[PDB]
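P.,

For your records, the input lines for the assembly:
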Amino acid sequence: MKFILAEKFTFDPLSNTLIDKEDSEEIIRLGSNESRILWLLAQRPNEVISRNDLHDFVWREQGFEVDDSSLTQAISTLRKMLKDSTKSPQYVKTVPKRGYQLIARVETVE
DNA sequence: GCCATTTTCGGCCTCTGTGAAAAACTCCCAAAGTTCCGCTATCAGTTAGTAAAATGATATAAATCCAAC
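C-alpha cells returned:
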C-alpha cells in the first residue's frame, strides 16, 4: 500500500521510492533504514513513538545491533533529503525524553 | 708566694607519664564574628544534531583455467 505525506510526497514501504508532486520527473532515492523508520512513523499517525521501541523494531528485525547514534543520523538524513525544516515542526520533529513525531498527513493510496 | 672563695665534675642500658594556693567591678565604644540571602561561576548529567571519517558491502572489470568437443 502506497502512502502520501502532507499531500506533497508519495512513498511506498515495499519498494522504497519517493516522489515529489512539485517535481514528478525526479525520483528521490532513500536508504532502507530511513525508509523503514518513516514507514513505522506512518503506521502510527501523528502520535509519539519511543526512540527505544522504534529503534528495536527497525534494527533487531534486521538481525543486527547498532548504537543509538545510528538512529539520530538516520533521522538527520531523512530530514535532509526530504528538505524538511532544520528545526521547525513541518514534517518530522523530535520530542525530547519521549521520542519522535511526524506532522505530514497520511493518505493511503490503496 | 700565699689564703680563700667560686667553679666544675661525678658509668652505661631499660621503664617512666602532669594535673593539686593566690580575692573586683562598671560603663562605653569599636571591631571581629555569626548568619542569611542574593548573584555568579563551575561542573556533572543528559539529550539531540550535523558534518565527516571509517568501514564494510556491493559492483564492475579482467585472468585464466578447465571441460568438452
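Two observations worth noting. Residues 72-73, 75-76, 79-80, 86-87, 94, 96-97 of chain A lie near DNA strand B (CB under 10 Å from a C1'). DSSP finds three helices and seven strands in chain A.

Regards
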